[PDB]
Amino acid sequence: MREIVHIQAGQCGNQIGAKFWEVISDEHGIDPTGSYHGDSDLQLERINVYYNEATGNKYVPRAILVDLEPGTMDSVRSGPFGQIFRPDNFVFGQSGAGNNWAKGHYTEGAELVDSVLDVVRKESESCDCLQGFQLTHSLGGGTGSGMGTLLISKIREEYPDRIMNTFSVMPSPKVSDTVVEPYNATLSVHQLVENTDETYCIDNEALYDICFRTLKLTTPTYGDLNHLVSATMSGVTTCLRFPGQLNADLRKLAVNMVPFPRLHFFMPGFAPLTSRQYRALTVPELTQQMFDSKNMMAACDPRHGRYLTVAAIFRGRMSMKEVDEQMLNVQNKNSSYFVEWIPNNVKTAVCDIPPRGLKMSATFIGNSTAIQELFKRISEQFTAMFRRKAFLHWYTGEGMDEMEFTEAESNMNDLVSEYQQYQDA
Amino acid sequence: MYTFVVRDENSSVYAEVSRLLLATGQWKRLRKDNPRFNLMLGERNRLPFGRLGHEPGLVQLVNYYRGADKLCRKASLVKLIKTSPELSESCTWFPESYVIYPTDEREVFLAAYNRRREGREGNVWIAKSSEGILISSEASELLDFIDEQGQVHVIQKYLEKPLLLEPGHRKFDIRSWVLVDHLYNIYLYREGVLRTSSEPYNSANFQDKTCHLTNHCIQKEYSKNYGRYEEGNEMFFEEFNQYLMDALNTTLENSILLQIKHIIRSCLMCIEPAISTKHLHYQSFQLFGFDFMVDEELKVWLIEVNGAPACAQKLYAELCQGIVDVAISSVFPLATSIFIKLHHHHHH
Amino acid sequence: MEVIELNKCTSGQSFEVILKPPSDPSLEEIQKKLEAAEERRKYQEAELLKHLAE
Amino acid sequence: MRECISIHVGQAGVQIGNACWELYCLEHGIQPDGQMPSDKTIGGGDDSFNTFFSETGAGKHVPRAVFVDLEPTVIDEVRTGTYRQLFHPEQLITGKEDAANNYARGHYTIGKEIIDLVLDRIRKLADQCTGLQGFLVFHSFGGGTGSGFTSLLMERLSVDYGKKSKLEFSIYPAPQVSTAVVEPYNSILTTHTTLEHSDCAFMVDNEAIYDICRRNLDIERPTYTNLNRLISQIVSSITASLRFDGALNVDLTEFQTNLVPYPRIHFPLATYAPVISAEKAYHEQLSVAEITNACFEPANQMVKCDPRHGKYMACCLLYRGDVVPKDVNAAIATIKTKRSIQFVDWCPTGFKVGINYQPPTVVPGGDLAKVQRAVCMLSNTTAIAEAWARLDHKFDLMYAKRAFVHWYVGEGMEEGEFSEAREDMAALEKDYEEVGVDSV
Numbered sequence A: 001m002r003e004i005v006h007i008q009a010g011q012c013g014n015q016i017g018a019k020f021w022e023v024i025s026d027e028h029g030i031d032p033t034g035s036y037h038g039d040s041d042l043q044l045e046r047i048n049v050y051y052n053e054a055t056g057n058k059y060v061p062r063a064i065l066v067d068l069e070p071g072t073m074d075s076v077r078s079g080p081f082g083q084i085f086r087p088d089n090f091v092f093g094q095s096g097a098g099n100n101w102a103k104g105h106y107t108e109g110a111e112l113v114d115s116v117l118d119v120v121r122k123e124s125e126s127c128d129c130l131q132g133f134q135l136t137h138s139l140g141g142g143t144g145s146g147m148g149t150l151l152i153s154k155i156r157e158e159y160p161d162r163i164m165n166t167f168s169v170m171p172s173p174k175v176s177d178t179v180v181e182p183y184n185a186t187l188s189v190h191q192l193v194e195n196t197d198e199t200y201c202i203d204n205e206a207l208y209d210i211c212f213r214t215l216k217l218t219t220p221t222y223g224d225l226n227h228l229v230s231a232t233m234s235g236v237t238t239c240l241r242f243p244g245q246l247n248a249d250l251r252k253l254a255v256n257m258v259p260f261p262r263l264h265f266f267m268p269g270f271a272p273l274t275s276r277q278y279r280a281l282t283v284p285e286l287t288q289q290m291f292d293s294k295n296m297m298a299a300c301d302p303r304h305g306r307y308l309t310v311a312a313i314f315r316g317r318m319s320m321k322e323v324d325e326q327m328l329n330v331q332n333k334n335s336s337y338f339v340e341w342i343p344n345n346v347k348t349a350v351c352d353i354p355p356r357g358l359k360m361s362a363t364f365i366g367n368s369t370a371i372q373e374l375f376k377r378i379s380e381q382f383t384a385m386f387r388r389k390a391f392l393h394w395y396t397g398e399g400m401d402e403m404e405f406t407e408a409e410s411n412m413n414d415l416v417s418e419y420q421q422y423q424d425a
Numbered sequence B: 001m002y003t004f005v006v007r008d009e010n011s012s013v014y015a016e017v018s019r020l021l022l023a024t025g026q027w028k029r030l031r032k033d034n035p036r037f038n039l040m041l042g043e044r045n046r047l048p049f050g051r052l053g054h055e056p057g058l059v060q061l062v063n064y065y066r067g068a069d070k071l072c073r074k075a076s077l078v079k080l081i082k083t084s085p086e087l088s089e090s091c092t093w094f095p096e097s098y099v100i101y102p103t104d105e106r107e108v109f110l111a112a113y114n115r116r117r118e119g120r121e122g123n124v125w126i127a128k129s130s131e132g133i134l135i136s137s138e139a140s141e142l143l144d145f146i147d148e149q150g151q152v153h154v155i156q157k158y159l160e161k162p163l164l165l166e167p168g169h170r171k172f173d174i175r176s177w178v179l180v181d182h183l184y185n186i187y188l189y190r191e192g193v194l195r196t197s198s199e200p201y202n203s204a205n206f207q208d209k210t211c212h213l214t215n216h217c218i219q220k221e222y223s224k225n226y227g228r229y230e231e232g233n234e235m236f237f238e239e240f241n242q243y244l245m246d247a248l249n250t251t252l253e254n255s256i257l258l259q260i261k262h263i264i265r266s267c268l269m270c271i272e273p274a275i276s277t278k279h280l281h282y283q284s285f286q287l288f289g290f291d292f293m294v295d296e297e298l299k300v301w302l303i304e305v306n307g308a309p310a311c312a313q314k315l316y317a318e319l320c321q322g323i324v325d326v327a328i329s330s331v332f333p334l335a336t337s338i339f340i341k342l343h344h345h346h347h348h
Numbered sequence C: 001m002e003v004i005e006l007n008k009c010t011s012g013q014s015f016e017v018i019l020k021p022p023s024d025p026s027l028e029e030i031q032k033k034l035e036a037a038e039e040r041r042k043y044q045e046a047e048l049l050k051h052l053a054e
Numbered sequence D: 001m002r003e004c005i006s007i008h009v010g011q012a013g014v015q016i017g018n019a020c021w022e023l024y025c026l027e028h029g030i031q032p033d034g035q036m037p038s039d040k041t042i043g044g045g046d047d048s049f050n051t052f053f054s055e056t057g058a059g060k061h062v063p064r065a066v067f068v069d070l071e072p073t074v075i076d077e078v079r080t081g082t083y084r085q086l087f088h089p090e091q092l093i094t095g096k097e098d099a100a101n102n103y104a105r106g107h108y109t110i111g112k113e114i115i116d117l118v119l120d121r122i123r124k125l126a127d128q129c130t131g132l133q134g135f136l137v138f139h140s141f142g143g144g145t146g147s148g149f150t151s152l153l154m155e156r157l158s159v160d161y162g163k164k165s166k167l168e169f170s171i172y173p174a175p176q177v178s179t180a181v182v183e184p185y186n187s188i189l190t191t192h193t194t195l196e197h198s199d200c201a202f203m204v205d206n207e208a209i210y211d212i213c214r215r216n217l218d219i220e221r222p223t224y225t226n227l228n229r230l231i232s233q234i235v236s237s238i239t240a241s242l243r244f245d246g247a248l249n250v251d252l253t254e255f256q257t258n259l260v261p262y263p264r265i266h267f268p269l270a271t272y273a274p275v276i277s278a279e280k281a282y283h284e285q286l287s288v289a290e291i292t293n294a295c296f297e298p299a300n301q302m303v304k305c306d307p308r309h310g311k312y313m314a315c316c317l318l319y320r321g322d323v324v325p326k327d328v329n330a331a332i333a334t335i336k337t338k339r340s341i342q343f344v345d346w347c348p349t350g351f352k353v354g355i356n357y358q359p360p361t362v363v364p365g366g367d368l369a370k371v372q373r374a375v376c377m378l379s380n381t382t383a384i385a386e387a388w389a390r391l392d393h394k395f396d397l398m399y400a401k402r403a404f405v406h407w408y409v410g411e412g413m414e415e416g417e418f419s420e421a422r423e424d425m426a427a428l429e430k431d432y433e434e435v436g437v438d439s440v
C-alpha cells in the first residue's frame, strides 16, 4: 500500500484537482518546476504516495488530467503549477459533453476512455504496490459526471482488487449552471454506490453558504469555493501523505469508515474556516468547530442523524493529551449522536505539520446517516422534472431509455432508506 | 452535564433518585445500554461489574457493591458470621443458626437441639429461605419442610421472649437504612421504622403466623387489626422513643441504637477488604436495609441484611435526597446531616 | 506454612510455600480451508466481472 | 540446555520484540554488534543464555528469533536500526501490502502466499537446535497480521512441531491506542482458532499499560515506545528463568505444569511492581513486603480485573533483586490475613517462588528508575474472564447488525466462522464461571 493514482475529469474536477496539487506540493516542499526545497524530512518520507521520482530528483505527480474539451486543461497547463504535470498524462478531446451525462458515459466519452486507460495502465505498471485510485469531479456536468463514472467502471474491471476513492462535487440550485444537474447527479450516484469504496460528498450548497454566511464573501466565486475544497482535500489525505498510525492507507480507511458496502458517502469538515487571520486557535476550539454543522462541506444537519463512524485529524504542534481529552469530551457529551452498536467509532490522528497559513487545524470525516438529506434533495429536484419527462430529449437523443432513469432513481431512494434503517437501529 | 443510566425499573428508591437528578438540570439520562455514563443505577441480578471502569474520560460509579451478596443472602450471612474471626462463633448478637440443604450442617444442628431437649430450655426454631416459613419446637417437622422445598434453607433460633408494645402485647422488628459511599464511610439514616405486628403475641400456637411475622405484607392481608395503633403498622423513632421513656424509663439511643450501630459497623467492616472500591477502576456505593429484633432484656438481634431495600413512604423524599448528596454528588459535584457516620477508633 | 523444594545457586534460589492443602488438524485439512476460501474469492470476483461485462 | 525460538508477528509483535531483545542484550552483556566479552566459550556452548542466543565462530551472539510482518516499514526499522548487526537477513521477513486490520485478509488471503516461506525460515533456526523446546509467539489481537496470520502459523506449528510447546504474548485491544473499529472481531476470531494450539498465553491489555504509564511514570500521553519498554520488563521477568540459572520454570513445559491445570484456561494474569519514574527526584526504595503487597492491587495488573471475585488455580512469584525466602514468607503471611485470596478446592493454597539476585535492568535514558528489588506475579485467576466479557460484548453489539462483516466475507471467509468463534468464547466464559463461582 504505497502509490495512489490521481485522476481529474471535467471542468470542476480539473480546477479543484489543480488546486489540490498546488496545496500539497507546497506542504511537501515541491516547487512548480518539481524540485524539492523543503526543510523537514517528514515531507519526503511518504512523498511516493502521490509523486513519481524522475532524474535530477524531480518529483512528478501521479496525476492524469481528463476532459472532453481542451478549454479548462489549457488553463491548468498555464496555471501556477501547470508545468509540474507529466505532459503525456494530458488526455483530452474536442467535442465537449454539454453538461450531458449520456454524452460523457455512452457516446463522446466512450470514444476517449480507452486512451485514458492507456495512461492509467502506464502509471499503474510502474507502481511498486498500487493501493488504488482517487478521482476528482463534479456530478452535475457531463464529462466529470458521465465519463468519470465510466472510467470508474472500467478501472474496476481492470483493477477489481484495488480501492476506488472519489472527491465528488454535488450540484446545488444556489450554485447552478444548468437545470439538468439533478439528472446527471442521480445517474452518477447510482454508479458511485456500486463502484466506489469511499466518496467525500462536497456540496456546492454548503461551500456557498460557508463563503456567504461565515467568511462574509458577498459574491462567492468558484475560486472562493475551491479554497475550501483544496483545504478539505489536503486534510482528509493527511494520514495518507505523512507518517502515521491511523488510516495511513486507503484500504485501512475504508475498513474503519465503512460498516456496510453502500454506505460509504462521507461528510467532510474543516476548521478553522479560512478565506483568502492570526487567531491562535486552542484545541477545545478546533474540536468544537470541526464538529460544528457550519463547518461541514455537505449541507446536512448532523443532529438529524447519527454517526456510524468518524475520523478526526489534528494538524500542528499541540498537546496530544488535550486532543484526547477534547475528543472524549464531545463523544461523552453528545453520545446520543453516535450509534451504540459500533463501539469506539471515533478514531483520531495527529500530524506535526500544519497546512499553509495556520498554526493549528482540524479535519473531520464523518459517516453520518444525515447524509441522506443530501440525496433526498437531489431526488426531489430529479422527480420534479422527471414526472413530466422534462429535458429528457437531451438524453434519449444519445440512446438512453427512460427506464434507465427510473432505475437510477429507485436505487438512490433505496440508499436513502438504508440510511434511515440504521438511524433507527 | 453528568450522565447516568437506569437498569432497574422496579426500584422505588432509585426511581426517586432518578427524578431528583433530572431536577438539578445537571444530570442527563441515557439509554440503559449506552456505555458512556458516569453513573449506573444497575440491576439486581448479574450486574456486569466486569464492564465498568473501562471508558476513558469517564469517572464511573455504580449503586451496588460487588460481593455484597455475602451479607444479603440468608445462607451466606450465616456462613460469613461463623467463619469470620472478627465475627466468630462467639457472636452475641446473632441468633444460633445452621444452613440446611434439602456443605450442609444438618449433623451439627441436631447436636445443640438435643441439649435443649435435655436442658428443658425453649427449643423453638424458625426455618426460612433467601412465603416459606415454619415455626416449631419439633426438629422432625423442621427438617421435613426443608426437604419438601427445593432450595437452601436456614434454621435459626426463634426468639421466644420478644419485647412487646403495650397496649397490644404485640411483636415488631426494626428496619435501619445504611448508606455506604465510595470511600466506605458508613452512614446510618437517623430515621428508622418499626414494622409492628397488630395482633397480640402468643407462645402456644406458633402456626398462627400473623402475630409472629411482622412483615408489612402479611400484616396488611392476613391480619384484621392492620392500622389500629399506628398508620399501616409502622411506628417511627420519635414515638417509639417516647414509649421507651414512659414505659421503661430509658431512651432509644441507649437501650437499642448503640447495639444497632455496633452490629451494622461490625458486619460491614468484616467484608470491607472483599468489596471495597478504594483503588479500583470503578467505584461503588449501596443502600442496605438491616432488620433487627429486640428481646425483653432490651438486647438487639440481627435478622437479615437487605441489599435492595425499599423505604417507608414518608421517608423517601429525605432519604433519596441524602443518597444524591453523600453518595453521588460527592463524586460528581453540582454547580445538619440526615445521617450518622459510623466510626470508632478504640486503641489497644 | 511449609517451605519445600528449596534450591539454591550463585545467581539465586527458588522454593514453594503452601498455606493450606487441597480442600489438531492436519496439513491437508488446513490447505483445504485456505483453498476453499480462495475459491470463494474467485467466484465473487467472477460474478463481478460478469456483471461488469453485462 | 534446550533452545527456544521467538516469533514476532505484526507491528505490535515486532516492536515489542525489539524492546525485549534490547533488554535481553543489556541483561546478558551482549553488545549491539553481537559480541559478548563475558562469554569465554567462543563459537559455541550450552549455557542458560544459549536458550535464546546462538553463536558464530566470530563470537557473534544471534537471537533465535523470527520477525514477520505483511508490510515492510516496521521491520525495515530493525534492518537499519541500532541492532541491525544482531539479526541475520533471513530472520527478517516482510511482504508488500498488509492485512488492513482484517483477520480474514491476514489469515486466508495474504497468509496463504507467505506461510510456506515463514515455516521454512523457522525451519532454518530449528535445524540449528540440539533440542528445541518450542516457541514464544508475540502478536496483537487487533491487527490483521497479528490476529489472522498468527492463527494460521499456530495451526501449522502444531503440525510441523506437534510435540513442542507454544507460549503466547498477546496484546489485548484498547481504544486509547487502537487503530481499528473491528479489533473486537479480530480478537475473537484469532482466539478461537488459536485456542487449542496454545499451551499458555500471557495477555496484556494496552489499557492497563497505558494507565500505569500515566499514573506511575508521569507520562501525559504514552507512546508505543513507552508501552513496549514497560511490557518488555514483564516479558523479561517471565522468561528470565529460561535464560538464567535456577530451578523454577526452567523449560516451556513447566509453565503449563505450574500455571495451567486445565488446558483451555491457559491465560495467567500477570502483575508487576514497582514501576518508578526515572524523573522522580527523590524515591524511597520499596521493601519485599511492599512490592509483594502491590501484586494484589488491580492498578498494577497487566489486565484490569478483580481477582477477589474469582478463584486462583496457581500462583507464581518471580523476584529480581535483593530478596531472600525469609522476607517473602513473612510478606505472604501478612498479606494472607489482610486480603481475599481463595483458591479452588481442588488446588493447594500456595505460592511457587523464584528469586534472581540480579535486580531489574533498565534501558539507559528510559522512563523506568532502577530499583533494588522488583517482582512479577503470575496468577491463574478466573477474574481475567472479565476481559473476555468486555470483548465479547463489543463483538455482539456489532455482529447483531453485521457491521463490517462484508470486509471479511469479501476475503473468502464464511459468515459462519463469526458465530463459531463467538460460540467458542461463550463456552470459554462459561468454563471460567463454573471453576470460579459458587451458586449464590
Ligand SMILES: Nc1nc2c(ncn2[C@@H]2O[C@H](COP(=O)(O)OP(=O)(O)OP(=O)(O)O)[C@@H](O)[C@H]2O)c(=O)[nH]1
Pocket: D009, D010, D011, D012, D013, D015, D016, D069, D070, D098, D099, D100, D101, D102, D106, D140, D141, D142, D143, D144, D145, D146, D147, D171, D173, D174, D177, D178, D179, D180, D183, D206, D224, D225, D227, D228, D231
Ligand atoms: N503495546 C503495543 N501495542 C501495539 C503496538 N503496535 C500496535 N499495537 C496494537 O495492535 C493493534 C493493531 O495491530 P497491529 O499489530 O498494529 O497490526 P498488524 O499486526 O501489523 O496487522 P495489519 O492490520 O496487517 O497491519 C492496535 O490495537 C494497537 O493498539 C506496540 O508497539 N505496542
Ligand SMILES: Nc1ncnc2c1ncn2[C@@H]1O[C@H](COP(=O)(O)OP(=O)(O)CP(=O)(O)O)[C@@H](O)[C@H]1O
Pocket: B095, B126, B128, B130, B156, B157, B158, B159, B171, B172, B173, B212, B213, B214, B215, B291, B293, B303, B304, B306
Ligand atoms: N429468628 C427469628 N426469631 C423470631 N422471629 C423471626 C426470626 N426470623 C424471622 N422472624 C420473623 O420474620 C419476619 C421477617 O422475616 P426476614 O427477616 O426473614 O425477611 P423476608 O426475607 O422473610 C421478607 P423479603 O422476601 O421481602 O426480604 C420478622 O419481622 C420476624 O417477625
Ligand SMILES: Nc1nc2c(ncn2[C@@H]2O[C@H](COP(=O)(O)OP(=O)(O)O)[C@@H](O)[C@H]2O)c(=O)[nH]1
Pocket: A009, A010, A011, A012, A013, A015, A016, A097, A098, A099, A100, A138, A139, A140, A141, A142, A143, A144, A145, A169, A170, A171, A172, A175, A176, A177, A181, A204, A222, A223, A225, A226, A229
Ligand atoms: N466547486 C466547483 N464546482 C464547479 C466548478 N465548475 C463547475 N462546477 C459544478 O459542476 C457542475 C458542472 O459540471 P462541469 O465540471 O462544469 O462539467 P464537465 O466539464 O462536463 O465535468 C455544476 O453543478 C457546477 O456547480 C468549480 O470550479 N468549482
Ligand SMILES: [Ca+2]
Pocket: A111
Ligand atoms: Ca466522434
Ligand SMILES: [Ca+2]
Pocket: D039, D040, D041, D042, D043, D044, D045, D046, D055
Ligand atoms: Ca559461548
Ligand SMILES: [Ca+2]
Pocket: C024, D158, D162, D196, D197, D198
Ligand atoms: Ca497442542
Ligand SMILES: [Cl-]
Pocket: D160, D161, D162, D163, D164
Ligand atoms: Cl515434534
Ligand SMILES: [Mg+2]
Pocket: A011, A012, A141, A177
Ligand atoms: Mg461547466
Ligand SMILES: [Mg+2]
Pocket: A114
Ligand atoms: Mg487501445
Ligand SMILES: [Mg+2]
Pocket: D010, D011, D069, D070, D071, D098, D099, D143, D145
Ligand atoms: Mg501492520
